[PDB]
């Protein structure tokens, strides 16, 4: 059964790094695509990032272009590496694949012809080095 399993969230400080996973099950045609978008706090959706498992191509928003990083662990996983986290990266985070088209990707962040799963909640403020 095509699932999409995520986990990683939390409340770092600015500056901070994180990294979210999405495992990626029953998915057997060569063209999807995987990866985030993102839906911030008062804001329309917004892509992240994608990798196509064609050729294994990853795509980033321009917004996280330099300080964000897709892998893959051939178990199915696909881990987003998030690095000098801004406050404006706060948002709930949305593992998602699609038939080959990191649809997210375009402006509004919509994902078509395609899945999600279920949000993670990533933060990042200065109330993290409250812990």
């Known amino acids: 059964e095509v699932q999409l399993q995520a986990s990683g969230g939390g409340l770092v400080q600015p500056g901070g790094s994180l990294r979210l996973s999405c495992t990626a099950s029953?998915?057997?045609?060569?063209?999807?695509?995987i990866g985030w978008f993102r839906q911030a706090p008062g804001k329309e959706r917004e892509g992240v990032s994608c990798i196509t498992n064609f050729d294994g191509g990853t795509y980033y928003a321009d917004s996280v272009k330099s300080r964000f990083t897709m892998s893959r662990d051939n178990k199915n996983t696909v881990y987003l590496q998030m690095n000098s986290l801004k406050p404006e990266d706060t948002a709930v985070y949305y593992c998602?694949?699609?038939?080959?088209?990191?649809?997210?990707?375009?402006?509004?962040?919509?994902?078509?012809?395609?899945?999600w799963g279920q949000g993670t909640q990533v933060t990042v403020s200065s109330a993290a080095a409250l812990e």
């Open positions: 029953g998915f057997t045609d060569d063209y999807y695509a």
């Open positions: 998602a694949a699609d038939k080959g088209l990191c649809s997210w990707l375009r402006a509004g962040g919509k994902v078509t012809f395609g899945s």
